[PDB]
Amino acid sequence: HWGYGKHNGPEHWHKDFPIAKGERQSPVDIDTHTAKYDPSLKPLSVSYDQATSLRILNNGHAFNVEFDDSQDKAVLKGGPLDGTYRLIQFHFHWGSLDGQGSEHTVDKKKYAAELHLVHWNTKYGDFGKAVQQPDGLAVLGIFLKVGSAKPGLQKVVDVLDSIKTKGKSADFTNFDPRGLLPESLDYWTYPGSLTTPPLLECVTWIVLKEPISVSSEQVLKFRKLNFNGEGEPEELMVDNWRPAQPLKNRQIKASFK
Ligand SMILES: O=C(O)Cc1cccc([N+](=O)[O-])c1
Ligand SMILES: [Zn+2]
């Protein structure tokens, strides 16, 4: 099955998921000089005061912080979006070293990591139906750089030892994702895809300009996770990022001057 190795990594995904070579794949390089300011874009509205995290999961590709999405409790609206998108999970992508890890790039710059907060459009009723629609998901992407620790991340880091290997989960209640957000909500937006199989072209991407800072110690704990299951040969969970894909016939829009 797909993964991030030599034999099963991004460069192979098209054989099982031919949409990998589609017209609206993600991530992309954001060329800041050609992304045009769009005065018609709105401020993003991130409303996470009632978010209810439940659990953290090592799915063998990353770890997922999961939310109860059975009511409108944590929603993303505004920005480029029409309607209301409910938070279902967040996860990260990261590198073996601080010089790579992000999926999106900014003028070819790679960040150490990228956080994806995934939301589904309530007009389609459930996540599985939303991913079948071109406006089904809104993913908020946030870059991570290594410097100061992010106090709001530490709860996540400290639970990772309990989900070392693929298929492990653990209770993870009361975690507040507001602690992961940067000060500014300035963003770039473009139409794209999931960045893991099945690579469905269902996402409005909203990539924040301002990275968050995490400490080296924090990211080092991400790199102690395993892609393998309990008791199998250890292969560290690192470099679980898809590289930038062709922009094709897309425009990247900026919310800011
Ligand atoms: O399980 C998966 O890898 C598919 C999936 C599910 C939810 C979000 C995703 N994304 O690219 O942001 C991808
Ligand atoms: Zn992702």
Of 95, 89, 219, 227, residue with least CA distance to 167: 227
- Report the DSSP pairing between strands 44-47 and 63-67: unpaired
99: CB partners within 8 A, 6+ apart: 110, 112
* DSSP, res 110: P
As given in the structure block, the two tokens for residue 64 are 């997922």
Cα dist. 231→78, 115, 166, 174 in Å? 46, 28, 10, 31
What method was applied to determine this entry? X-ray
User: Which residue spans within the chain are E strands per DSSP?
Assistant: 29-30, 36-37, 44-47, 53-58, 63-67, 75-78, 85-94, 105-106, 113-121, 137-146, 169-171, 187-192, 203-208, 212-214, 253-254
Tell me, using a 6 A CB cutoff, whether residue 116 lines ligand 1: yes
Token pair 């473009």 in the structure block, residue: 190
CA dihedral sign, ordered 107, 108, 113, 118? positive
Tell me, using a 6 A CB cutoff, whether residue 139 lines ligand 1: yes
Judged by DSSP in three states, 127 sits in: helix
Tell me, using a 6 A CB cutoff, whether residue 118 lines ligand 1: yes
Of 211, 239, 237, 240, residue with least CA distance to 146: 211
In b/e form, how buried is each residue of 184-193, taking b as 16+ CB within 10 angstroms?
Answer: ebbbbbbbbb
Atom number in ligand 1 closest to CA 116: 12
Tell me the ligand closest to 113's alpha carbon.
Answer: 2
* DSSP, res 19: G
As given in the structure block, the two tokens for residue 238 are 């690192």
Domains in the chain with CATH codes: 1-257 (3.10.200.10)
Among 92, 118, 203, 242, say which to mutate for ligand 1: greatest number of ligand atoms within 8 Å of CB.
118
